[PDB]
Design a protein around this nucleic acid. Structure first.
Ligand SMILES: C[C@@H]1CN2c3ccc([N+](=O)[O-])cc3CC3(C(O)=NC(=O)N=C3O)[C@H]2[C@H](C)O1
Ligand SMILES: C[C@@H]1CN2c3ccc([N+](=O)[O-])cc3C[C@]3(C(=O)NC(=O)N=C3O)[C@H]2[C@H](C)O1
Ligand SMILES: [Mn+2]
Ligand SMILES: [Mn+2]
Ligand code: NA
Ligand code: NA
Ligand code: NA
Lengths: 188, 482, 480, 188
DNA sequence: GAGCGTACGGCCGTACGCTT
DNA sequence: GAGCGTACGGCCGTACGCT
């Protein structure tokens, strides 16, 4: 499923976690095949905060990311075994893109935490509008979000470990009621 | 490069999704009883004029119009929704008139979108009735290219008639279908007494009336759900114990509960016989045809009591199921847990406001028209002077000045006169203008009566609700046992 | 009971027939297979003209499917996609946005993910379609009407070409330069007995969107002479000299209908199989700004000229275009040569332009009739009015106006429908001014229909306009 | 995916070979599940007059048809092993529908000839209609073409083995030119 | 050869809440 | 304990004629 880059030098390599197959196709043509790898995401990823480890580890989408990062997870997590020094979350500029993005960050924080602490994880910044990713051509798609000289990335930083742990458990945990509250409290 | 806090990102993003799913995907509006996607199939059907009187249009085409003009989401979420609206075993009052394979109770999917046909049902005209007479607000669509209605007039109370069952975020909703004849009577009774109690409203509305019929056990659950907005209702299949000859016994199921897959219900019974968790059952057949309707036959061995098997089937298979009410609708753009009265009060309020805005729109146009007619009467009373005034004129711009100045006419009235045709000068035609103006003076007064007094409008609402009740009202399907 | 030979004979013929004339072969007039015409026409009826915004593909298809094309969506959408691809069409007929695939065999993203409208040149195919220039027919259900052929104000069949497989036969017509085609239609118009060899003085040979090279004029000649020939297509490649006695091959243009990525696979297969050797690396450097560019690096010892020549032979770096010029002519298929091809087209334009001028006549005279009654009315407007006033009903005024002022029904009706603002001076002049102009226009239109050369010259004049707005450089180099 | 009937008595049973996967499902719900089986046909089926035996016997569709009839092909064909005594060809009313009929009749004539001689091969008859079979529901599909009382099945009959032998060879064979001249002579 | 281009759909992942 | 109902596609067979 993943289309890898030709380079085997992690420090200059970067992988893009793209939403939907149609965008994953065009990103695969517009990319810089030397440095940039594309791992498509065919929809709504597993929420690992609600799944038990046997269901998480058997989950194909999750299984493909672990292999593609090649660091392993849990107590067997080595930052030196990483194949990419930039992991970029690239989702549509709509609310479902936002959701996928929350699901990925949940996986990462719960299983590859020191991958966030090192600043390896990034959020892509596609063009705002009604049009999504699968609707752009490969070239305007390369230029707007993938080209290092013109692109804008959001480097993900973990500033407060204890506060985040409380944030993931509320938003994505299995207790619904605390979620509801947060919605009603901030609903605009 | 810019830096984004992971915590902040998780709150801001997830709140966008959460909120979006709530007010704009998963929950119906308390007024028209529709989720966004639904509204847009109906409107799309309407803007194409796929009314009942015109032949079916291909499902392919409908979905495209709806997706390209209103609903920027995948084709299947639109289609499946339209197909649900065409199912007589899903909707108490079907909103879509489908042709071809639109799926069955056994849970098999509707044939693909190219292999089906669709238009509106006659009752959906009533959801859209009076839509163009400034009754409902319009807003821009996703791209700004088109316009779409924020709500539908909904001249029958649709939230309660067809129900709702949407899973959102941090909440869900589950409202059961109800009989229309009962629902409207309830509305009426609320229109005459603002302080009517729930238990009184339940003289009109006995309870939910599923499209699938079957049996409801006790009224105890209906009240809780109707008073608080939450509560449990026990649905039981209609099954009778036939006795063929002296020895033989047969258990025939004719109605099954709502949202209960028939094939999957049958398999569960086949499962229990196979695993020897139920004794007595010889054969098990599904003789469901169109003319007979639902018919599931269970053959029972002699020396085995059908009643013990039947009761044990209730407890063990979905032959008896609970309906967990959770009446949550969008009220002033926010989600809200509403009891039967709140449901009804909000609808009537919607209706009052829709009739009043209708009347206001009809008055404006009416007052506008009579103005034109007045200028036209003035012209035809002084025709030769008028003609003279226009011919004297070099352009049409000065013709207006010269007519406004000379006969005391508005800009509007001079335009109507300059836009009049010579065939308006015949003798019969003068009479028509005098007629049209006379009725119209009488019509403006009728309207001005309605807007000044709350009760005429109130009655007009009642009167029109009663028209829906008769034309579309039907007998109760679901028996309520005590 | 049915005879098994009979059942087979009839049923198979049924299928065959329809595929020949309602599927796989283009018409000689507008150069279109049924599905293409139905997509363009639907774009038109939807008003999907270049000046308006794009429209999502799924909607265009959805309409085209339901109104005219009773078949699967994939056959429709893929066809349109093709028309949008600048590497398939020498003069693309669809203007599409988003992903419409590549030379690398890349599919186009599904209907929902792409939007589309018509190109400016597609207007010329549809020009005058509403001026009774072409005959309409019922759709497959009788509920809509659709064209049997488009006016086609530029020679589409030879411009964009056609390649389809039928039953009993197939077709394969290469794309040509438009300027060359038109100029060849102009020479034909001037000389009905003009020779194939003389026509080629304009039309040099094909002209693929993908540029490239054609080896010799022998194939081209045979092609245009017999309607069947073989034309060699060769990539554009150069061997450039590099330091330390190294070399590399750079390929900047590839053959028509050749999958770029699949050609490269074949070069690499021959390197893994050691069927060819001397090649150190193989890069596809195709960018938007350089376009196509495949780079082949060469081992110092090897001779890169030998390598390149062996590649032409061993990969689709050089390919044949097998010309089989079969179009629908009079609704039957026919092997035709360059001249019949142009001759049926020119004849199509002479009909379109006639029927148009014919249409504009019936409309001019019809209007002029009405204006006359309006002029009458304007010269006695005092008595026209009172005459209407003495009338009880519109019918009496109609009767009175006709009997008194020697008017027709269309003329009485027109006067009745007259708006009082026409009586202002400026509008009174406008009515005279329109009449006068219209008279001189009917003159012009009656010149045209009365002399076959004036007509023919019109055709020439409009074709030359198209040439000067859409004509472009030739892309394919024909080598001797 | 063949859907078979309950009854194991070939004399009363019948198999419907239907065009398209859509008409398959509708037909399956509309059928007398006791005596009627359905074998859907995913599109155009192999022309066996054009293929060598090794492709034929490896052709999933041709495979699913033999397994269903249970009679073997060619010389090994055994009329007594026939699981159905009616084999009904159900295709759309359109031209492609006819093509798939000829294609079927070609296989039948060239590997199951005695099945035609024994009058087991039938052609169904849907209404002359622009509508496909897939488009029409289950009830219309059963009430018009599948119920014994209402249906019109043309029993397929063979009269001259030497004529038929050259007809298939010409219409379905390798040689195009002979199929060109047939078209030419007989088309108007 | 094979593959040019118009024709003739199923299967099965996820979030999310409430309730079994 | 499983499922209800709006959201986020690509793999692959065949006929047909020609170099
Ligand atoms: C109705 C289709 C179903 N679908 C499926 C189906 C099965 C599987 N599956 O793997 O079994 C994955 C998906 C993901 C889906 C898709 O097909 N592409 C995509 O990128 N986004 C999606 O949501 C998703 C698609 C958007 O919608
Ligand atoms: C574009 C699709 C492709 N398609 C395919 C694709 C793959 C396979 N396959 O199995 O590889 C079979 C078919 C048959 C097809 C068709 O023609 N008929 C049908 O009933 N269903 C279909 O999908 C056929 C379908 C009608 O059209
Ligand atoms: Mn999106
Ligand atoms: Mn068909
Ligand atoms: Na139970
Ligand atoms: Na019509
Ligand atoms: Na070659």
């Amino acid at each position: 499923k993943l289309a890898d880059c030709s380079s085997k030098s992690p420090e200059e390599c970067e992988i893009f976690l793209v939403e939907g197959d149609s965008a994953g196709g065009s990103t695969k043509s517009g990319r810089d095949s030397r440095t940039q790898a594309i791992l498509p995401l065919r929809g709504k990823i597993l929420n690992v905060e609600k799944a038990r480890l046997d269901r998480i580890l058997n989950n194909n989408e999750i299984r493909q990311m672990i292999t593609a990062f090649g660091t392993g997870i849990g107590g067997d997590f080595d930052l030196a075994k990483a194949r990419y020094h930039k992991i970029v979350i690239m989702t549509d500029a709509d609310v479902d893109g936002a959701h996928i993005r929350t699901l990925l960050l949940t996986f990462f924080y719960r299983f590859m935490r020191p991958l966030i602490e090192a600043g390896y994880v990034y959020i892509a910044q596609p063009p705002t509008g009604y049009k999504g990713l699968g609707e752009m051509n490969a070239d305007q798609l390369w230029e707007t979000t993938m080209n290092p000289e013109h692109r804008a990335l959001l480097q993900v930083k973990l500033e407060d470990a204890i506060e985040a742990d409380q944030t993931f458990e509320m938003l994505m945990g299995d207790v619904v009621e605390n979620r509801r509250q947060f919605i009603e409290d901030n609903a605009v | 490069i810019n830096e984004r806090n992971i915590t902040s990102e998780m709150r801001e993003s997830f709140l966008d999704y959460a909120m979006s799913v709530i007010v704009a995907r998963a929950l119906p509006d308390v007024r028209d009883g529709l989720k966004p996607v639904h509204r847009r199939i109906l409107y799309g059907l309407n803007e194409q004029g796929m009314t009942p009187d015109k032949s079916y249009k291909k499902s392919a085409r409908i979905v495209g119009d709806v997706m390209g003009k209103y609903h920027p989401h995948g084709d299947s979420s639109i289609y499946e929704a339209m197909v649900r609206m065409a199912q007589d075993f899903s909707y108490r009052y079907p909103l879509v008139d489908g042709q071809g394979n639109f799926g069955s109770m056994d849970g098999d999917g509707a044939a693909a979108m190219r292999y089906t046909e669709a238009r509106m049902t006659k009752i959906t005209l009533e959801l859209l009735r009076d839509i163009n007479k400034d009754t409902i607000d319009f807003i821009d669509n996703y791209d700004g290219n088109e316009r779409e209605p924020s709500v539908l007039p909904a001249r029958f109370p649709n939230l309660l008639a067809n129900g709702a069952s949407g899973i959102a975020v941090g909440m869900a909703t589950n409202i059961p279908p109800h009989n229309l004849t009962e629902l409207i009577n309830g509305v009426l009774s609320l229109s005459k007494n603002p302080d009517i109690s729930i238990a009184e409203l339940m003289e009109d509305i006995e309870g939910p009336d599923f499209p699938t019929a079957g049996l409801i056990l006790g009224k105890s659950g209906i009240r809780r759900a109707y008073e608080t907005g939450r509560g449990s209702i026990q649905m039981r299949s209609r099954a009778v114990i036939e006795e063929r000859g002296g020895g033989r016994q047969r258990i025939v199921v004719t109605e099954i509960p709502f949202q209960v897959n028939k094939a999957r219900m049958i398999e569960k019974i086949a499962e229990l016989v196979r695993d020897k968790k139920i004794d007595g059952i010889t054969d098990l057949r599904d003789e469901t045809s169109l003319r007979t309707g639902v018919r599931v036959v269970i053959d029972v061995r002699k020396d085995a009591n059908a009643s013990v098997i039947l009761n044990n089937l209730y407890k063990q298979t979905p032959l008896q199921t609970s309906f967990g009410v959770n009446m949550i609708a969008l009220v002033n753009g926010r989600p809200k847990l509403i009891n039967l009265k709140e449901a009804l009060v909000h609808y009537l309020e919607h209706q009052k406001t829709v009739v009043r805005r209708r009347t206001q729109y009809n008055l404006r146009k009416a007052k506008d028209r009579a103005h034109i007619l007045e200028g036209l009467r003035i012209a035809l009373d002084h025709i030769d002077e008028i003609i003279s005034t226009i011919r004297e004129s070099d352009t049409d711009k000065v013709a207006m000045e010269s007519l406004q100045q000379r006969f005391k006419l508005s800009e509007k009235q001079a335009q109507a006169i300059l836009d009049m045709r010579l065939r308006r000068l015949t003798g019969l035609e003068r009479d028509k203008i005098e007629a049209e103006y006379n009725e119209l003076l009488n019509y403006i007064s009728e309207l001005e009566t309605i807007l000044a007094d709350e009760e005429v409008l109130l009655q007009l609402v009642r009167d029109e609700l009663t028209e829906i009740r008769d034309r579309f009202g039907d007998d109760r399907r679901t028996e309520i046992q005590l």
